[PDB]
Design a protein around this nucleic acid. Structure first.
Ligand SMILES: [Mg+2]
Ligand SMILES: [Zn+2]
Ligand SMILES: [Zn+2]
Ligand SMILES: [Zn+2]
Lengths: 84, 43, 130, 114, 156, 196, 47, 559, 65, 160, 266, 138
DNA sequence: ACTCTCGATG
RNA sequence: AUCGAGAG
């Protein structure tokens, strides 16, 4: 079972924990010489690169938000709003 | 050294309290803190 | 140019637990509906009781403050005691009574009048002579 | 144990230059100069001698941290006046005053007893 | 009257009458419909729960009831037009800013607020110096004292 | 620490030039902060300072005995007799600039004692060291080059923050991390894992 | 300046700390608690 | 509990802490030796292969350097013993365990870790000497001084976890605490007393010093503000130059007592657009208060700007204070002669009232209050009288103090000390108490052998007429000693029982959090709160606002 | 131990002034203040340096090894 | 007691009333007394409140008392925290203490409860009844050394 | 001359009491700082202990050896050991002097600074000779020997700056006071009743005119008159202390000027 | 010669001790402390000197009667952690670890009780020219 | 029923 | 392992 892309009740805004997890994961990927999907423009620090990569929504990850019953809603990083 | 050689230990109502009778026999100020306060006294 | 010009009569001088700044209380000798409260550096320009000081408000004489060089520069004052502050409140007592509140680096001022070209602007040069 | 060497207060390190001239990006025609292995003894004096020059708009020194013997001196002058010349004039003025003071003290000392 | 609520409206308003430099001697380019329907439609966006069923919606209105009271109290037509003299642009900016700040003020899912609570209570108990009060009373409360030291009956 | 329960460590050292100085050219051996006075109410510290100053000047031995009729007023009078501010204050000059200070400074001899808690005997750092045998965790002790206990309260703080990965790192990669084999049936560590 | 009053065991200086105790052969009366069936107890520690 | 719930860890350190006015809020002073000891594994990437090559080239002992080099196979190269510590071709994918360098995210901690602010992420600034140097305004959430206090420091070992530290546990992010919906950090001690001394209307600053202060601010626009005084001498006020530290778009308004937009006492606070209009800046403003300047700047300009604000304010105020000076002597505990006389006669009339009440009670005319003993009523009355005496004399001593009185100045600034401190140091230390009641009869019918039996007089039951300036008598000294003893005792007991209570609360509310439906549940899924906090807001983003609909007349409401 | 060679505070040499101090004390039968004053110790820091000092080396020399 | 009360004109005005304080508690019979207001009467024993006026009134009284203890020292703690504690104490149906007798007898995980107070005996009785551990408890993942479902680990990250 | 002026009030071997006229505050302060810390001096930097059967510890003795005032007259024609192209130290940078003392009489055998004997070749330069202002002619009391106690060691003295160690301090306490009437108002006097009766009156009040209450505050006045008293330790004469202070400050300004001259290189 | 007696607490219960020997005899200074007049007559014993109620560590504290008692306690605790000369024969003893002050100094403010504790002979600290001042903020 | 630091003795 | 002393 799953949850359809419509009728999703969770916050459309990305949580601070989701943001930290995404930035950390992406920076972990960059830290092991993985392809960068944005212009470096001088930046070398993988964390900063991941941040700039998030600001342009160039991160191909997705968030599986778990509901206490067992249900789960998927939220692509490109879709999630980052207001923090 | 002088202080250590004149020390009082107490095993185990309000023995920690500086009792009136301690006057002239036990120092009112000299005592450990945090744990054995009042229990350990100096003459 | 000029925004205000009047002569006031010092009615009270009060050193409120200070020794460099005294609160002054004066009134206009022209309008019987005009009065003035003003913090004054007595250490620089001493203000005794019952004095007739000439008071002026200006807007000029932003950019960084260059030292008065040489000058050999347009002072546009030749007063005795000059300050620079900022209006922060326009209190309307009556229709025939309008008051303004200036702040000269903390040295406050309350000018009560009637007829004014005192807008809420950083420009607030207070010039006092004699 | 972790304490730095004493001579690091006046002896320059490896590659460390005495003066570091930097174009101040805040206000135009301004400069920030990093003095290495120097303290307030030089900073305060030079800064105070820069304020005597009436063609100098801004002049201020600071020691960002007492651990390290170094201080930054910011100078801003009027257009058509290179600040390095202001620093040089200040320095020469200092040296002249000190020389005159030395001569005067010597002549005054040559008149004493005991 | 003074109570902890999200979004400081005062700072937003006094920021509005500063960002746009509005003068206190000029007619506002607003309408009654602008203010009334605008504020009424502002409460629609202040979301805490985002369900589509009746229960979640009731929980929503019950969750934003107080802040909405504050909102209507501060954004009343008389008050908006006479007390601050806001313009159209300034008013819309106020609404949007309020909505944004409210959405920011929502608690983030995952927030271990249990531990946060236990510490927020436990820590100020450390800095503590006629009934029984202070640490012994707290200890009585947490232990659920069968026989408290100072049982009292306050009768009105 | 002084002789009045006023303890504290050294924040920084200043050479005599940077140190504030009285007109006599006397520089303090020590600078303490006035905020450590009113909240602790150690008036006898101040009194000790004043008395010790007067005794220093006069070349006598100041009597600081408990129950005596020696008062701050008499001491002050004596200090004034020796040509100083009766309340111990002294006009001082900032060492950096040479300019006078506005407020005058309480300045005088005070018997300070050097406690035995020194930094180089306290300082500790470990990046992967010797482990214990029973628990395979970092050993206990600075002298044994051990690690610091990431206590329960620390864990609670990391939970409150939300840093789960950090909590996992402290509890695996930082301390003891082990790989075991589990049977898919009984689910116990009965597995005889003959590797290679 | 050494005042003594200590022992030397295996080269290590030992100090016997005075031990505080309740005096014996003294008669003392104590009021018992409320849930207790007895109201007062007069006791004595014989040595 | 000793090996699973909490265990010893690698990559950690511990040292004596010290304050540093020239460090930023989110910084931590790390001794060179510790910096060489602790290490971070960094994978060789094209972005940093040069820097890493240099670090390996330096090796250990020299900072910044490296300790070990891990290859593809998993072999560890010890740079301090290897024969190839000089020539190493760093292949991509290899790990390099380098020394901790500047701007690295570390976890600063101080036991006992009561709340989440006891562990905060700092930036590393490697420094000489063997102490952990931290910023003054971070003293409060850690609850630490520098009287020998030690702190611990942990180091993350991957990108994701240091991301966790920097993005979650960062000190600027912990400024406004969700505990008391207010900032838990602020300006204290020298910076507070100094910022009080600076914002006085008498405080004027001449050109040179103004230029120095201006330069001291890192976020300075390089624009000299027009002096409040033009003629006859160009002068700046403390408020004026302090306004530079406060960012633009900052509006702060607070009315105290007689604050009437003109403030004859220069009280209250008005700050418009990063410019302080009027009022003395102290604890009520730049402290860790609810409607404080820190709260406002944080919620408005952001945490970074706010931390940088801590920096600025501290630098400027500490500079001005450094070149102004502040002290405290015994003279700040000496009230005037006639004041001491009024204090003495006040104590006298107090003891006289106690004497009268005593004689009345002994005459069996004392009528007991409903619900208590004659003797209890007597005790209550006498204690109340002596308390009113201490407060009376104390307030006399406080009134007698001048505005130049350093103690009173610190009290005004809110830096340290209070009324009772002045009252006891200068006037009268008051009645000593043990277990609530005044000094009971240890000996038969008397408190001390120097008293006669049945002596309920104030001085006998432990009243101290003298102040700390005057000196205590033997009886007074011993009674005070009893009081203090009880103090230390119940202090220890308090820290113990609290120590346990905290743990109990934590282990109770352990697994409680907010799920992705704003429903506060536990590990069982059991609902504790359907909407967290009954409103669904985070405690951090909440300020005390007035509801001006609930108050006032119906006429005023309508109007 | 033994008289400190120079004063801590300023830096004045006070190591050569110990024996002379003792002589001014016992031979001329002066008080400590006047003895300290005659030795050119005007500042109370150096005055302290000598007045406060306790010569312990004389007790240390009582041992034979 | 002084008291703020709405005046017929509108504004809140201080109207002082007489209030009977009492050493002793027996709410079950005092509120039924003719003469006093039986709707405003209160005791500092939330136990009796819980017995007489229900579990919700017990909740309100419990929070009132805790808040009173916190604010007694002059300190201030936000509502949601104390509300959380009180709620978790009152959600079981009765008053659950914060001790080994109270919440430690709940139907949570074995490891979790074993990580507090009675450790070994819990493991014993859990081994006897053959309990199932959900391993979604914090201390359980702490023991197992896995990333607990806490904040960051409160979800899953995948790739699309 | 033409600039700043000096007026010597008192003059002796150990002290110079003078008045500095026509000078900026910063220059007087900087002069004081240089005089305190940045003047070159010869002092014991290395100690090689052969035999030490005295009560005092090795480095305990070495320390107080370091503080011994040595002759630093011709110190300017001596060189820094860090500059000299020699191994460790030589005769062009360092002065080596030995110390050999032994308990002879039954009474306590004192070990002074006069027992130090210059060994290295001074080749004409007045340097190394331990200052003895002692009346008896002994100097600094270094140590005390019993009956059979011996102290044999060798001292290597090097040129050093007091900024590196206070043992190289050419001066002790420098008295410094400007405006004895507080006419500039740089100091807000603390008081209980009267401001003038409580605070003592400076000697330097005799050399300036008291303020008139009828006169307002002079806000355009600066600091011109300074009252200084420089005290030497013996290593360097007072006049030479202040003069070499001046020349040192001048030289380190000239080094910055020279640096500016050098930074114009491509 | 029956001039001094040994009194324990049990016997202390039934006597009337005078605090000072001047309390046997049958305009003032506002500076001094307020001492209660002797409202008793039938004395039997007199205190030798009140300062003897303290211990060895507390007798080192200067003006302890002008301090808040817990501060006296803390000083009584930290007095045992100060360095100095613990014995004259420290150079011929082989202790596990011992610290000796380079230049010990007898305090300028002393107690009359320091005479018997040999603290002026074996001090544990130095007279530092202290300055209570806000300076660099360090 | 908080972290440390040592010392002893089996 | 346990015991003793001490640090906030
Ligand atoms: Mg502490
Ligand atoms: Zn199996
Ligand atoms: Zn000296
Ligand atoms: Zn050489």
């Amino acid at each position: 079972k799953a949850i359809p892309k419509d009728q999703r009740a969770t916050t459309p805004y990305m949580t601070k924990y989701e943001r930290a997890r995404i930035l950390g994961t992406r920076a972990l990927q960059i830290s092991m010489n993985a392809p960068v999907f944005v212009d470096l423009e001088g930046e070398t620090d993988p964390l900063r690169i991941a941040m700039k990569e998030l600001a342009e929504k160039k991160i191909p990850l997705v968030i599986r938000r778990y509901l206490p019953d067992g249900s789960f809603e998927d939220w692509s990083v490109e879709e999630l709003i980052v207001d923090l | 050294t002088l202080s250590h050689l004149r020390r009082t230990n107490t095993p185990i109502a309000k023995p920690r309290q500086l009792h009136n009778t301690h006057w002239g026999l036990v120092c009112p100020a000299e005592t450990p803190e945090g744990q054995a306060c009042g229990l350990v006294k100096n003459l | 140019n000029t925004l205000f010009d009047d002569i006031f009569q010092v009615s009270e001088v009060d050193p409120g637990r200070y020794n460099k700044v005294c609160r002054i209380e004066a009134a206009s000798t022209t309008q019987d509906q005009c009065k003035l409260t003003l913090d004054i550096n007595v250490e620089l320009f001493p203000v005794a009781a019952q004095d007739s000081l000439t008071v002026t408000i200006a807007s000029s004489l932003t950019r960084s403050w260059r030292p008065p060089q040489a000058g050999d520069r347009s002072l546009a004052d030749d007063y005795d005691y000059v300050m620079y502050g900022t209006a922060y409140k326009f209190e309307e007592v009556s229709k025939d009574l309008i008051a303004v509140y200036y702040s000269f680096g903390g040295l406050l001022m309350r000018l009560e009048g009637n007829y004014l070209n005192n807008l809420k602007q950083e420009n607030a040069y207070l010039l006092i002579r004699r | 144990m972790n304490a730095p060497d004493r001579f690091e207060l006046f002896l320059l390190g490896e590659g460390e230059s005495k003066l570091k001239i930097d174009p101040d990006t805040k206000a135009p025609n301004a400069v920030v100069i990093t003095f290495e292995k120097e303290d307030h003894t030089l900073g305060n004096l030079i800064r105070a001698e820069l304020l005597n020059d009436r063609k100098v708009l801004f002049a201020a020194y600071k020691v960002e941290h007492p651990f390290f013997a170094r201080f930054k001196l910011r100078i801003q002058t009027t257009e058509g006046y290179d600040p390095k010349d202001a620093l040089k004039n200040a320095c020469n003025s200092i040296i002249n005053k000190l020389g005159a003071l030395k001569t005067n003290f010597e002549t005054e000392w040559n008149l004493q007893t005991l | 009257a003074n109570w902890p609520l999200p979004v400081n409206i005062r700072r937003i308003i006094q920021n509005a009458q500063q960002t746009f430099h509005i003068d206190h001697t000029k007619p506002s380019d607003l309408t009654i419909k602008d203010i009334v329907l605008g504020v009424k439609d502002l409460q629609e966006n202040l979301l805490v729960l985002r369900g589509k069923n009746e229960i979640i919606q009731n929980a929503q209105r019950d969750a934003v009831t107080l802040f909405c009271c504050l909102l209507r109290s501060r954004l009343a037509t008389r008050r908006v037009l006479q007390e601050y003299r806001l313009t159209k642009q300034a008013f819309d900016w106020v609404l949007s800013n309020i909505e944004a700040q409210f959405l920011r003020s929502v608690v983030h899912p995952g927030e271990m607020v249990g531990v946060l609570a236990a510490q927020s209570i436990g820590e100020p108990a450390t800095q503590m110096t006629k009934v029984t009060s202070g640490v012994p009373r707290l200890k009585e409360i947490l232990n659920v004292a069968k026989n408290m030291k100072t049982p009292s009956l306050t009768v009105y | 620490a002084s002789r009045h329960g006023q303890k504290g460590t050294i924040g920084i050292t200043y050479r005599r030039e940077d140190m504030p100085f009285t007109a006599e050219g006397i520089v303090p051996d020590l600078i303490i902060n006035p905020h450590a006075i009113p909240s602790r109410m150690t008036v006898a510290h101040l009194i000790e300072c004043l008395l010790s100053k007067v005794a220093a000047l006069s070349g006598n031995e100041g009597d600081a005995s408990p129950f005596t009729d020696i008062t701050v007023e008499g001491i002050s009078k004596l200090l004034r007799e020796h040509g100083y501010q009766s309340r111990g204050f002294e006009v001082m000059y900032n060492g950096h600039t040479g300019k006078k200070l506005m407020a005058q400074i309480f300045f005088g001899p005070t018997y300070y004692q050097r406690l035995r808690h020194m930094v180089d005997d306290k300082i500790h750092a470990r990046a992967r060291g010797p482990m214990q045998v029973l628990t395979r965790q970092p050993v206990e002790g600075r002298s044994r080059d051990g690690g610091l206990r990431f206590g329960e309260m620390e864990r609670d703080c990391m939970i409150a923050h939300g840093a789960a990965s950090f909590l996992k790192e402290r509890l695996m990669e930082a301390s003891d991390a082990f790989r075991v084999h589990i049977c898919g049936i009984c689910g116990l560590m009965t597995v005889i894992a003959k590797l290679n | 300046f050494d005042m003594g009053g200590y022992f030397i065991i295996n080269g290590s200086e030992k100090v016997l700390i005075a031990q505080e105790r309740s005096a014996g052969n003294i008669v003392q009366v104590f009021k018992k608690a409320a849930p207790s069936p007895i109201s007062h107890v007069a006791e004595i520690r014989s040595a | 509990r000793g090996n699973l719930m909490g265990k010893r860890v690698d990559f950690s350190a511990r040292t004596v802490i010290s304050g540093d006015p020239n460090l930023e809020l989110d910084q931590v002073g790390v001794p060179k030796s510790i910096a060489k000891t602790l290490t971070y594994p960094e994978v060789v990437t094209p972005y940093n292969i040069d820097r890493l090559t240099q670090l390996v080239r330096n090796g250990p002992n020299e900072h910044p350097g490296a300790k070990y080099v891990i290859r593809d196979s998993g072999d560890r190269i010890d740079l301090r013993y290897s024969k190839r510590a000089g020539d190493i071709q760093l292949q991509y994918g290899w790990k390099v365990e380098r020394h901790i360098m500047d701007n690295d995210p570390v976890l600063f901690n101080r036991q006992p870790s009561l709340h989440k602010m006891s562990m905060m992420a700092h930036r590393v600034k490697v420094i000489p000497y063997s102490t952990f140097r931290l910023n003054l305004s971070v003293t409060s959430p850690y609850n630490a001084d520098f009287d020998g206090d030690e702190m611990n420091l942990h180091v993350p070992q991957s990108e994701e976890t240091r991301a966790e530290l920097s993005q979650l546990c960062a000190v600027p992010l912990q400024i406004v605490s969700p505990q008391s919906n207010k900032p838990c950090m602020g300006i204290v001690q020298d910076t507070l007393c100094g910022i009080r001394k600076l914002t006085l209307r008498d405080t004027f600053i001449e050109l040179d010093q103004v230029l120095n202060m201006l330069y001291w601010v890192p976020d300075w626009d390089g624009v000299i503000p027009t002096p409040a005084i033009i003629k006859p001498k160009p002068l700046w006020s403390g408020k004026q130059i302090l306004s530079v530290a406060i960012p633009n778009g900052i509006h702060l308004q607070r009315f105290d007592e007689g604050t009437t937009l003109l403030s004859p006492k220069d009280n209250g606070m008005l700050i418009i657009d990063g410019q302080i209009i009027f009022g003395v800046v102290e604890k009520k403003t730049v402290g860790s208060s609810n409607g404080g300047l820190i709260h406002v700047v944080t919620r408005e300009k952001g945490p970074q700007v706010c931390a940088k604000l801590f920096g600025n304010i501290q630098k400027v105020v500490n500079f001005w204070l450094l070149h102004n000076g502040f002290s405290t002597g015994i003279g700040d505990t000496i009230a005037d002669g006639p004041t001491m006389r009024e204090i003495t006669e006040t104590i006298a009339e107090a003891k006289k009232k106690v004497l009268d009440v005593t004689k009345e009670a002994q005459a069996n005319l004392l009528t007991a209050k409903h619900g208590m003993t004659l003797r209890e009523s007597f005790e209550d009355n006498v204690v109340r009288f002596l308390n009113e005496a201490r407060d009376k004399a104390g307030r006399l001593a406080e009134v007698n103090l001048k505005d130049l009185n350093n103690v009173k100045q610190m009290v005004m600034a809110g830096s340290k000390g209070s009324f009772i401190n002045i009252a006891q140091m200068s006037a009268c230390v008051g009645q000593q108490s043990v277990e609530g009641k005044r000094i009971a009869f240890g000996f038969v019918d008397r408190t001390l052998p120097h008293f006669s039996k049945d002596d309920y007089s104030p001085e006998s039951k432990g009243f101290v007429e003298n102040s700390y300036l005057r000196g205590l008598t033997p009886q007074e000294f011993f009674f005070h000693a009893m009081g203090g003893r009880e103090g230390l005792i119940d202090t220890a007991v308090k820290t113990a029982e609290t120590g346990y209570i905290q743990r109990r609360l934590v282990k109770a509310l352990e697994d409680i959090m907010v799920h992705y439906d704003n429903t506060t549940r536990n590990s069982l899924g059991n609902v504790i709160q359907f909407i967290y906090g009954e409103d669904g807001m985070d405690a951090a983003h909440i300020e005390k606002q007035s509801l001006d609909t609930i108050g006032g007349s119906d006429a005023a409401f309508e109007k | 131990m033994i008289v400190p060679v120079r004063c801590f505070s300023c830096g004045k040499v006070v190591g050569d002034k110990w024996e002379s101090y003792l002589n001014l004390l016992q031979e001329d039968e002066l008080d400590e203040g006047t003895a300290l004053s005659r030795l050119g110790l005007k500042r109370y820091c150096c005055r302290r340096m000598i007045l406060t000092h306790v010569d312990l080396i004389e007790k240390f020399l009582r041992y034979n090894p | 007691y002084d008291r703020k009360v709405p005046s017929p004109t509108g504004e809140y005005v201080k109207e002082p009333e007489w209030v009977l304080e009492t050493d002793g508690v027996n709410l079950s019979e005092v509120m039924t007394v003719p003469g006093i207001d039986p709707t405003r009467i209160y005791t500092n024993s939330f136990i009796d409140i819980m017995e007489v006026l229900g579990i919700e009134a017990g909740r309100a009284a419990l929070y009132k008392e805790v808040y009173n203890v916190i604010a007694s020292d002059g300190s201030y703690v936000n509502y949601r925290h104390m509300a959380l504690l009180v709620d978790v104490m009152t959600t079981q149906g009765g008053l659950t203490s914060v001790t080994r007798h109270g919440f430690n007898r709940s139907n949570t995980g074995a490891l979790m409860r074993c990580s507090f107070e009675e450790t070994v005996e819990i493991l014993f009785e859990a081994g006897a009844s053959a309990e199932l551990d959900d391993c979604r408890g914090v201390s359980e993942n702490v023991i197992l050394g896995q990333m607990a479902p806490i904040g960051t680990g409160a979800f899953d990250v995948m790739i699309d | 001359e033409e600039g700043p002026q000096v007026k010597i009030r008192e003059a002796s071997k150990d002290n110079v009491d003078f008045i500095l006229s026509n000078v900026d505050l910063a220059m007087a302060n900087s002069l004081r700082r240089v005089m305190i810390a940045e003047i070159p001096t010869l002092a014991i930097d290395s100690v090689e202990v052969e035999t030490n059967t005295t009560v005092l510890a090795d480095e305990f003795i070495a320390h107080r050896l370091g503080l011994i005032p040595l002759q630093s007259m011709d110190i300017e024609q001596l060189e820094y050991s860090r500059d000299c192209f020699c191994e460790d130290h030589c005769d062009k940078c360092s002065v080596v002097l030995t110390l050999q003392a032994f308990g002879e009489s039954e009474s306590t055998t004192n070990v002074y600074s006069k027992d130090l004997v210059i060994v290295s070749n001074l080749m004409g330069r007045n340097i190394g000779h331990p200052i003895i202002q002692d009346k008896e002619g002994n100097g600094v009391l270094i140590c005390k020997l019993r009956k059979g106690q011996e102290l044999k060691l060798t001292c290597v003295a090097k040129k050093g700056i007091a900024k590196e160690h206070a043992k190289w301090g050419p001066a002790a306490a420098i008295e410094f006071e400007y405006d004895p009437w507080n006419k500039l108002k740089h100091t807000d006097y603390w008081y209980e009743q009267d401001s003038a009766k409580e605070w003592p009156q400076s000697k330097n009040c005799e050399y300036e005119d008291p303020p008139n209450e009828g006169d307002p505050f002079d806000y355009k006045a600066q600091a011109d008159t300074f009252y200084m008293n420089v005290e030497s330790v013996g290593s360097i004469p007072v006049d030479q202390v202040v003069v070499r202070g001046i020349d040192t400050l001048q030289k380190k300004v000239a080094s910055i000027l020279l640096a500016l001259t050098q930074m114009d290189q491509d | 010669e029956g001039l001094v007696e040994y009194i324990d607490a049990e016997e202390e219960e039934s006597i009337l001790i005078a605090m000072q020997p001047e309390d046997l005899e049958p305009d003032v200074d506002p500076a001094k402390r307020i001492r209660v007049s002797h409202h008793a007559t039938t004395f039997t014993h007199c205190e030798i000197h009140p300062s003897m109620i303290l211990g060895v560590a507390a007798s080192i504290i200067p003006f302890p009667d002008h301090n808040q008692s817990p501060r006296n306690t803390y000083q009584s605790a930290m007095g045992k952690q100060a360095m100095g000369v613990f014995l004259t024969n420290y150079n011929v003893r082989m202790d596990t670890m011992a610290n000796i002050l380079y230049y010990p100094q007898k305090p300028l403010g002393t107690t009359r009780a320091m005479e018997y504790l040999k603290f002026r002979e074996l001090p544990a600290g130095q007279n530092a020219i202290v300055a209570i001042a806000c300076y660099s903020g360090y």
